[PDB]
Amino acid sequence: PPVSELITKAVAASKERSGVSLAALKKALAAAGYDVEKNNSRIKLGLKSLVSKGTLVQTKGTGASGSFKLNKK
Template identity: 75%
Template sequence: MAEVAPAPAPAPAKAAKKKSTKPKKAGPSVSELIVKTVAASKERNGVSAAALKKALAAGGYDVDKNKARVKTAIKSLVAKGTLVQTKGIGASGSFKMTPLSSRCKQTGL
């Protein structure tokens, strides 16, 4: 007679990895804070990066801890066309809002 081999035991199911997501902080993003600061400024030549950081710090944002985020936000706002860089290179120099007509053309309004 032919012997039947017992079926191998099923492998134990792996436990699903738990994603440890941190809850998002309530409040506006860094980009929104920068846009509000620049829009509120009445300076003709724009707001310098140092003045932006001081305004963010005065508003309760920890600039020293989040220097990289501030730099990245400034660069991305310039790349999107929300801000225009009047002086400097990269995330340094002075920035002002683009004229309203230019923003409408970009967004298609």
């Protein structure tokens, strides 16, 4: 399954008012059996694609270093 679903599912499972950090996303995908080490660069890209698709709102920071929430709009 593509990493955009795994990320969206992790952000939905940890839904809050702040927003899953990249470190929490790493932890959730690793707990989901996804190798976050080798494919970290893929994650940053896929995450960026999800922000560029507007599917994730950046709530703090800039780019992948930030916190993110599912764009309910």
